[PDB]
Amino acid sequence: ATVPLPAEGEIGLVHIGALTLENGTVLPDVTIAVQRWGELAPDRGNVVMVLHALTGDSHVTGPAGDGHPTAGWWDGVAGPGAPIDTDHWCAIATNVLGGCRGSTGPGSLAPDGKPWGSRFPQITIRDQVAADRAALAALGITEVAAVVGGSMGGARALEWLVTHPDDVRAGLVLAVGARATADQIGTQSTQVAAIKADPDWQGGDYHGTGRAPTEGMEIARRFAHLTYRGEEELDDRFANTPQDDEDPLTGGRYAVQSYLEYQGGKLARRFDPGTYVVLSDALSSHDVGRGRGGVEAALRSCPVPVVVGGITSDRLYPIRLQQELAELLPGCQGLDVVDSIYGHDGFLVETELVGKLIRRTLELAQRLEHHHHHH
Amino acid sequence: ATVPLPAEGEIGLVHIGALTLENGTVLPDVTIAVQRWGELAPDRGNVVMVLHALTGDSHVTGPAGDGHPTAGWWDGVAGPGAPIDTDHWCAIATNVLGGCRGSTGPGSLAPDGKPWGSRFPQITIRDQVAADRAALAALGITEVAAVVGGSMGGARALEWLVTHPDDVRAGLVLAVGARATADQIGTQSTQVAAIKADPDWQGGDYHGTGRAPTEGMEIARRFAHLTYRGEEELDDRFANTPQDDEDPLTGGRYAVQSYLEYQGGKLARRFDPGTYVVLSDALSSHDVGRGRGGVEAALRSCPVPVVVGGITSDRLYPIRLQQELAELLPGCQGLDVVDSIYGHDGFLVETELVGKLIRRTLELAQ
Ligand SMILES: N[C@@H](CCO)C(=O)O
Ligand SMILES: N[C@@H](CCO)C(=O)O
């Protein structure tokens, strides 16, 4: 039983039915929202699975409007003759399980006709791969040419490569580690505590109450945005300068402060706090080594050709983590470094430099697929 | 009469009267808490001023108990034989202006007998130096051999050296920069917003209501504690290991999360949210160049012999900031590099390596 791909650029909803989660909970009636660019090859051997990060969605490329609150999160990276060449490749992006942009998440109605809220299960990165796999299977896709993602996207791509090495030709893994680190769990669990401390959280059951913990989420987002930026670049841009016509020595704002307020407010206009909590806990859960004897054993086991990218100034997934991935994956020829001042967010900002790592990944994927014989 | 020094180890309260603050606001009836170790020399010429950081107090050295929630924040640094050798030196530490362990802060009673709360003015690092100097003068002390501090204590040390070069013989400036960075203001201002978001903040007039924004302050402290850690040390200590037998895939805690919850909980038993906010805003205000032609002009103006120390793994005051200080201060012979895994908090953890920089500071004092 198969469902069609939606028209290029348009959101489709793929109903995958019940999903068994890693912790044994069965999540009934899951829907995954999908967008796609490029035509699916007759052998279905040309799928590039584009995996969004924490606040991304299915909208990889294109303008805001027509139900999209933002332009594509990798705008220009996909299209005819772009780094993801949609004259040859079928670029498919899901909204991750737990999301708020069309896929089943805490805001979605449970079988009892009420929002999941506090009843939404704890999900892992492996759960997110399982939901994406079932979505692709519902579209009649069983094999993918390449998985490509940065950050939570990189965690998704890596778990996909390690879990289904027989069903993926190649991967780009950007700005992530093999497992969540203490620092990342530290900041992720404290961002969650910020949301859960807001009185409007209502134990997670705020959905449809007309009150939401957006203030808690804005606080979390201000702290998260700093982890995503380059320390030096921030100081070059704002230093200790005041906001326009305000005096910080008598309670006015600094320019960086005003900026973080703005970033907070942007997110509150387009993103659900419950989704923030569920995806931040999923990020804390990241560990390719779990149930496999640890990170070294998991990665040494994986034969898939993988391009690994790190950003020089990344303060959240520092370069030592992508060095460790590159060294342990036998299919990784060595580390690619994105020389960016923009920190972790450089995987979204440096579209030309990331563009080149994507081109080499898909050059590799095409050669491997041409030489890969499967049912 | 001068105010007498308290007996060694004991808290004294030094009333300094009204204080004019940099923003113009006048703060009446200021008290500064002091503790000291060692005898004041007959000539009153052997004072080493110890300047605590964000959540420190006057309690530099000794055990917890007898009115002290914690042991000395620099235990062993001052004493007989110690880096601050109390056989020769008089080690004096204040509780900073704005603090909650004996000095005038937001929790202290204003002249109308109600807590300052939301009436407490915005103070700067420079105001903290003016208040400490007033305390010393009331004790009959107009000159100091040396000032020593890290973090907010480094900011205080630096402003002291740069504002009053004729009244200090030598300085130790640890783990700070000439001015607050955009990143430091980002995290400091967001820690403040977390406390003001807690509904128990009550506009800052929560004092005496029986509700305080300790939840907000725990959140702030959890984020702040991460900025103080070495990234690699933290991962070496906890990794992604669970707390005890808890299972994080069904709602249990990670070992680091549990450690961060302990950090927030411990600070909530000993520290006031209003002080957190007020001192966080003074850190954001840090700028040795304000009113002085900027940072280069101010630092190049300072003739004082200074030891500048930086922690290699520091992620909040990265070592490029101490290299800038070491270069521009004419009295600095070069950057003292503290090879530590412990991050910013290295300046508190590495008492042996910091001990050496203190001895070199006191050699320069003579
Ligand atoms: N800023 C991006 C990167 C997260 O690592 C996001 O919000 O999705
Ligand atoms: N960790 C210490 C130093 C932070 O600068 C404190 O809380 O004061």
Q: Which two tokens stand for residue B253?
A: 């805690």
Pairing type for strands A144-150 and B168-174 reads: unpaired
Q: Which two tokens stand for residue B160?
A: 């002291």
Distance of CA A160 to the CA centre of its chain: 13
**CA torsion A326→A327→A328→A330, rounded to 10°?**
80
Please tell me the distance from the alpha carbon of residue B57 to that of residue B51, in angstroms, as a whole number: 9
What are the pocket residues of ligand 1 if the criterion is a CB atom closer than 6 Å to any ligand atom?
Answer: A 53-56, 151, 228, 344-345
Q: Looking at chain B, list the stretches that DSSP marks H as alpha helix, in order from N- to C-terminal side.
A: 125-138, 152-163, 182-197, 214-228, 231-238, 255-270, 273-284, 295-300, 320-328, 346-349, 351-365
Q: Is some CB atom of chain A closer than 8 A to the CB atom of B250?
A: yes
Please tell me the distance from the alpha carbon of residue B111 to that of residue B2, in angstroms, as a whole number: 24
Q: Looking at chain A, list the stretches that DSSP marks H as alpha helix, in order from N- to C-terminal side.
A: 125-138, 152-163, 182-197, 214-228, 231-238, 255-268, 273-284, 295-300, 319-328, 346-349, 351-370
Please tell me the distance from the alpha carbon of residue A348 to that of residue B319, in angstroms, as a whole number: 28
CATH superfamily of the domain spanning A1-375: Alpha/Beta hydrolase fold, catalytic domain (3.40.50.1820)
**8 Å CB contact of A249 and B124:** yes
Please tell me the distance from the alpha carbon of residue A346 to that of residue A317, in angstroms, as a whole number: 12
Q: Is B55 in the pocket of ligand 2 (CB under 6 A)?
A: yes
Q: Which residues of A are catalytic?
A: 151, 314, 344
Please tell me the distance from the alpha carbon of residue A120 to that of residue A27, in angstroms, as a whole number: 8
B-contacting residues in A 182-241 (Cβ below 8 Å): 182-183, 185-187, 189-190, 193-194, 197-199, 215-216, 219, 222-223, 226, 229, 231-232, 234-235, 237-240
| Closest chain B residue by Cα to residue A194 | B219
End-to-end CA distance of chain B: 30
Burial (0-12, 13-18, 19+ Cβ within 10 Å), A113 = exposed
Largest CA distance in chain A: 71
Distance of CA B111 to the CA centre of its chain: 27
Q: Which residues contact A291 (CB under 8 A, 6 or more apart)?
A: none
Per DSSP, what are the bridge partners of residue A148? Answer: A50, A172
Phi, psi of B258 (to 5 degrees): -65, -50
Instruction: Spell out the domain ranges in chain B.
Output: 1-366
Please tell me the distance from the alpha carbon of residue A203 to that of residue B49, in angstroms, as a whole number: 49
Structure solved using which method? X-ray
**8 Å CB contact of B234 and A181:** yes
The resolution in Å comes to 2.0
**8 Å CB contact of B249 and A193:** no
| Closest chain B residue by Cα to residue A282 | B249
Say if domain B1-366 classifies as CATH 3.40.50.1820. yes
What is the DSSP annotation of A224-269?
HHHHHS-HHHHHHHHTTPBPTT--GGGT--BHHHHHHHHHHHHHHT
Q: Is B51 in the pocket of ligand 2 (CB under 6 A)?
A: no
CB B148 within 8 A of CB B155: no
Q: In a mutagenesis test of the A interface, which of B240, B243, B250 is the best target, namely the one with the most A β-carbons within 10 Å?
A: B240
**8 Å CB contact of A222 and B186:** yes
CB B217 within 8 A of CB B267: yes
Q: Which H or E element spans position A144? A: strand A144-150
Mutate-to-test residue for ligand 1 from A275, A348, A351, A354, highest number of ligand atoms within 8 A of CB: A348
